[PDB]
């Protein structure tokens, strides 16, 4: 995988594992589907974690496209801010 | 094939499973609302019919040393997910 500090997938899972964050990000729809209830707030919070003050939703959504090819995530068609976590694809990326 | 941590995350990513397992308490903490049901469901997935809560809890405590899961204090049937420790175990 590689390699360094906190990555977007980890931060999103941390946010999704706390119901206190339901106002900006939440598990919704089933089968690893989650929705960005407040896309700009998720982006602002990721900006604080990585000490990147110029962080916005455009840059955040750009970083999610890396996970489609790596098969860690996918984007729900028809919907605007609904994404899906692929735990089988994540576990595969974890294996040596 | 599938490991316990992956199966638990899959269960926890669906609110329809709230009756047996759910994110509760914050900071990666989750509770086994029905411990025997989680164990029964894990038994179906791994085709292990002899699976019970005793065997499941033993496997959950194994992730403490691997730093994927952490012990929760002051709460019964509660476990904590360490996403930092998981990400570290994912790195080569």
Numbering used by the authors:
A (entry chain A): 42 to 137
B (entry chain B): 46 to 137
Please quote the authors directly.
The Ets transcription factor family consists of 28 genes in humans containing the evolutionarily conserved 85 amino acid Ets DNA-binding domain, originally identified as a viral oncogene (E26 transformation-specific). The Ets domain is a variant helix-turn-helix (winged helix) structure, comprising three α-helices and a four-stranded antiparallel β-sheet. Here, we present the crystal structures of the Ets domains of the entire PEA3 subfamily (Etv1, Etv4, and Etv5) together with the structure of the Erg family member (Fev). Furthermore, a new Ets dimerization interface linked by a redox-sensitive disulfide bond is identified, and this dimerization is shown to result in a significant inhibition of DNA binding, potentially linking Ets transcription factors with cellular redox regulatory mechanisms.
